[PDB]
Amino acid sequence: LTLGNTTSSVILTNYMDTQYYGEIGIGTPPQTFKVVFDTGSSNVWVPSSKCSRLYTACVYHKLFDASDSSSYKHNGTELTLRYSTGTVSGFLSQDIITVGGITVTQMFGEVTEMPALPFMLAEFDGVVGMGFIEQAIGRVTPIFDNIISQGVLKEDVFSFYYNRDSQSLGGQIVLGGSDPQHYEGNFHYINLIKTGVWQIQMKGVSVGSSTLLCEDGCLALVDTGASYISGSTSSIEKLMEALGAKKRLFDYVVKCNEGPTLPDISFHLGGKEYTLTSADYVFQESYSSKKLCTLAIHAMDIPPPTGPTWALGATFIRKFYTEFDRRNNRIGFALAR
Numbered sequence: 496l497t498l499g500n501t502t503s504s505v506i507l508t509n510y511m512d513t514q515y516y517g518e519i520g521i522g523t524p525p526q527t528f529k530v531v532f533d534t535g536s537s538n539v540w541v542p543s544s545k546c547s548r549l550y551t552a553c554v555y556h557k558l559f560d561a562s563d564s565s566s567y568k569h570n571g572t573e574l575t576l577r578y579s580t581g582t583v584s585g586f587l588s589q590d591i592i593t594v595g596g597i598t599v600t601q602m603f604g605e606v607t608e609m610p611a612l613p614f615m616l617a618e619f620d621g622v623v624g625m626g627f628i629e630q631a632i633g634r635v636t637p638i639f640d641n642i643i644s645q646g647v648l649k650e651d652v653f654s655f656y657y658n659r660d661s662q663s664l665g666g667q668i669v670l671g672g673s674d675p676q677h678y679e680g681n682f683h684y685i686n687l688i689k690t691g692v693w694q695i696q697m698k699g700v701s702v703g704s705s706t707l708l709c710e711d712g713c714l715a716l717v718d719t720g721a722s723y724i725s726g727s728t729s730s731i732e733k734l735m736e737a738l739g740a741k742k743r744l745f746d747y748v749v750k751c752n753e754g755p756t757l758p759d760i761s762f763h764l765g766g767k768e769y770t771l772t773s774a775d776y777v778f779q780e781s782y783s784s785k786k787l788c789t790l791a792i793h794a795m796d797i798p799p800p801t802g803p804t805w806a807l808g809a810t811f812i813r814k815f816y817t818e819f820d821r822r823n824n825r826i827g828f829a830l831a832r
């Protein structure tokens with residue numbers, strides 16, 4: 496490993512507190528795409544010009560055209576990428592990628608099959624996987640590994656800041672460090688259970704004062720790509736019963752008026768209790784006894800080897816500025832500013 500003295504930041508756009516995306520440029524001249532920087536995955540992908548316009552999602556997103564890039568290198572290896580909400584398929588291509596002033600030769604997937612659900616709901620075009628090569632489909636080197644190889648970065652770390660929805664900054668990713676302007680106090684690190692996944696041990700989940708869940712220990716995937724905090728269908732049923740929340744098809748709700756009275760939810764990670772108040776987990780659109788308010792906590796049965804696991808997504812990261820440490824295989828949390 497080579498360490499330089501550079502840090503690079505990417506400004507993120509906050510869409511509705513659920514999608515946080517920045518810009519990247521692919522090719523010569525650059526074709527720009529809005530992308531989600533996802534710690535839960537390791538592949539880079541954008542929609543392809545080769546995507547049939549019978550996929551409505553491709554009609555609604557920016558497409559990569561290799562015929563317009565002078566730096567494009569053909570590959571063609573097929574690939575399928577599975578996510579929680581849906582799936583995408585295409586083929587591999589290589590070209591130059593610009594990410595916050597860093598220029599890297601990157602192998603990425605050109606998506607030719609992108610389902611309307613969920614991709615018609617996405618404000619972003621593609622994805623930039625911030626995970627490890629162990630999770631990469633087709634064993635493609637992830638973009639951070641390629642940026643590490645350049646020996647420009649001050650430290651072998653990257654940081655996430657996700658702001659609350661407002662003409663302010665939507666969020667920020669720092670490559671090579673952290674930004675002290677966005678956190679308070681000190682970072683408290685949790686070592687990874689194993690290299691290859693941004694997953695840590697969780698010692699318990701408490702609703703109110705009582706350690707209601709994850710009593711004998713459980714897993715926590717720190718996922719920048721997930722909008723919500725998620726647990727198993729079982730865990731979430733217990734949690735929701737404790738909150739007085741009723742299950743809908745895609746979410747759990749409470750009557751808007753009962754939102755500010757909901758108890759604090761605590762997550763025991765390392766040597767600290769990471770607490771969320773109802774203001775941190777309820778989408779408080781109104782205060783009406785005649786309306787229903789959604790929660791930023793969802794059931795999600797993540798399959799093995801990764802799952803069963805809880806996922807600490809945007810709901811968590813908004814409260815806690817997150818540092819992902821590749822040199823020491825750990826994750827640091829600090830109160831976000």
Ligand SMILES: Cc1ccc(S(=O)(=O)N[C@H]2CNC[C@@H](C(=O)NCC(c3ccccc3)c3ccccc3)C2)cc1
Binds near residue numbers: 806
């Ligand atoms: C069935 C399944 C496969 C994989 C996972 S995982 O937890 O291992 N993978 C997560 C990686 N991070 C993104 C998660 C996700 O699907 N988030 C929804 C989101 C999105 C973000 C990045 C990449 C794909 C999907 C999203 C999609 C469309 C609109 C709004 C948000 C899945 C769980 C369950």
Ligand SMILES: *[C@@H]1O[C@H](CO)[C@@H](O)[C@H](O)[C@H]1NC(C)=O
Binds near residue numbers: 570572587
């Ligand atoms: C695609 O890229 C991988 C990268 O190592 C390489 O092994 C493979 O042979 C490439 N395929 C083609 C057809 O260029």
